């Protein structure tokens, strides 16, 4: 059970840790988050009380180092940093725990929600989408644009999601125009799975990461990527049976976790109607179709 200590909380802020969140008052004696489950990535995210614009946060894995949060009054945000001195860090955490100035990661024993949302998500893949090689953790915010969005302007602050474009030479074999456009199986299986991602686990990891950035930061480019990766599978007539079964589980937990009040902005009507009712896989996503019909029948 790992800990992310906070130096202090000088500005009033809503702090998120994965799907949980806590309001902290200006100068409230708050010194961090303990009992963080080992074995998963995690995200610690922020929304200032005085500027509900720019949700921002940090993806990290406590197996990779000792991380803490400290407010920077110059850049005006909570920053993640690595403590390289193990003994200084253990002494900081032990003191804050003794003074009970830390919130406990509030996981119910029965509850596999976080595992289910991050099953294929790996820190090493996050660090290739979010390029800042001198840190072991990754900063994401509401405003960061994707490589694909940029093509259509600061490269160092981009989300390097895999570009998916249904009307591209990458997607369409010369001589198989109609076949490849109406059945995206060669784009899914040869170009994306065999070629770029190497396996379904890396594809799902990027799909799950895109969703989580959409949900936690309202990152529009991430929402675009999540839907594109769903549509590429649903629009393929030939998909391995293990992948369809796994996709139904992935999407079920994503739709289950989505705040009810954000379905209007975070869910693309066209993609979901096409995926559940028109696509090759209209009958392959039973769990997802049932939760969508019970939770968001207006969208459909």
């Amino acid at each position: 059970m790992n800990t992310v200590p906070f130096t202090s909380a000088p500005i009033e802020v809503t702090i998120g840790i994965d799907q949980y969140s806590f309001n902290v008052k200006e100068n409230q004696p708050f010194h961090g988050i303990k009992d963080i489950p080992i074995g998963h990535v995690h995200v610690i995210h922020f929304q200032h009380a005085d500027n509900s614009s720019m949700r921002y946060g940090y993806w990290f894995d406590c197996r990779m180092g000792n991380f803490y949060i400290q407010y920077d009054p110059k850049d005006g945000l909570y920053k993640m940093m690595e403590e390289r001195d193990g003994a200084k860090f253990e002494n900081i955490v032990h003191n804050f725990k003794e003074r009970q100035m830390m919130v406990s990661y509030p996981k119910i024993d029965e509850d596999d929600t976080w595992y289910n949302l991050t099953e294929f998500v790996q820190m090493d893949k996050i660090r290739k989408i979010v390029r800042k090689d001198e840190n072991q953790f990754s900063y994401v915010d509401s405003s960061m644009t994707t490589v694909q969005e940029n093509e259509l302007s600061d490269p160092a602050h981009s989300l390097n999601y895999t570009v998916i474009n249904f009307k591209s030479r990458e997607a369409i074999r010369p001589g198989h125009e109609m076949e490849d456009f109406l059945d995206k199986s060669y784009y899914l299986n040869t170009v994306m799975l065999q070629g770029i991602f190497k396996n379904s686990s890396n594809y799902f990891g990027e799909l799950q990461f895109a969703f989580l950035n959409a949900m936690f930061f309202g990152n529009y480019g991430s929402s675009l990527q999540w839907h594109a990766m769903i549509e590429l599978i649903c629009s393929s007539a030939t998909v391995p049976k293990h992948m369809l079964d796994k996709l139904d589980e992935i999407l079920y937990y994503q739709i289950k976790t989505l705040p009810e009040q954000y379905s209007d902005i975070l869910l693309n009507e066209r993609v979901w109607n096409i995926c559940l009712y028109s696509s090759f896989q209209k009958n392959s996503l039973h769990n997802t179709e049932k939760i969508m019909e019970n939770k968001y029948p207006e969208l459909l």
Partner: protein, 237 residues
């Protein structure tokens, strides 16, 4: 964006452009079977690819053999159209390739865009204009070469005959769209108007009769009258 009443003069500028109309690509007769079910029988069709500035018509004849053993023919017809338009562009010298292709039906956009991926600088555009190019098969010489075809064939025409010697490409296009709109609304009446005077003939190398400038004014008036009559009938107004 969309070609409309607003940007109509753009058709007659010096940027090469083609209209593509796929209406007549997949053509069928619907009939009863012996068992009293319904079946279709395909007949030869054509792609109508027109340069509105020069009148050059690339009439690609679609022989019924194309459809043999294929499913979802109305879908396939759009992709076959886009394949043949792409092939036509690739066959043209670079300086003759269009800068824009305007499709008369929005359902042609995705098929043509995907077939033209190798030409990122050729703009594929829809139109808000309700153009009467479906009536091309009411032009006897075009109908005749399509029906007689025994294999896939491209036939080249000038749909304006020699009109551009006397009139601009704006005026020529307006005369063509009026003739085709009349043929579309009441074919029999339009054909009667065009052939009524036995002394005005169609040249072997032409599609339309050899009207003088004054006879064209009379003809164009007769076509306008035909169209408005039919309209009052259609709508009881």
């Amino acid at each position: 964006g969309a070609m409309n009443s607003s940007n109509y003069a753009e058709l007659f500028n010096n940027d090469i452009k083609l209209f593509v109309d796929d209406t007549n690509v997949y053509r069928v007769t619907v009939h009863k079977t012996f068992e009293g079910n319904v079946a279709t029988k395909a007949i030869n069709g054509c792609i109508f690819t027109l340069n509105p500035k020069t009148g050059h018509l690339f009439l690609k004849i679609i022989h019924t053999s194309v459809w043999a053993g294929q499913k979802r023919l109305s879908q396939l017809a759009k992709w076959k159209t886009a394949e043949e338009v792409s092939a036509l562009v690739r066959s043209l010298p670079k300086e003759e390739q269009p800068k824009q292709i305007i499709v008369t039906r929005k359902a042609m956009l995705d098929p043509l865009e995907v077939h033209m991926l190798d030409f990122p600088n050729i703009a594929i555009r829809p139109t808000e204009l309700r153009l009467p190019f479906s009536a091309a098969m009411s032009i006897d010489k075009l109908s005749d070469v399509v029906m007689k075809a025994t294999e896939p064939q491209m036939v080249l025409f000038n749909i304006y005959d020699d009109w551009l010697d006397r009139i601009s490409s704006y005026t020529a296009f307006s005369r063509l769209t009026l003739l085709l709109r009349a043929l579309k609304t009441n074919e029999e009446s339009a054909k009667m108007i065009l052939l009524s005077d036995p002394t005005i003939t169609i040249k072997s190398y032409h599609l339309w009769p050899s009207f003088t400038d004054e006879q064209w004014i009379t003809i164009e008036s007769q076509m306008r009258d035909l169209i408005l009559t039919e309209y009052g009938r259609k709508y009881n107004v």
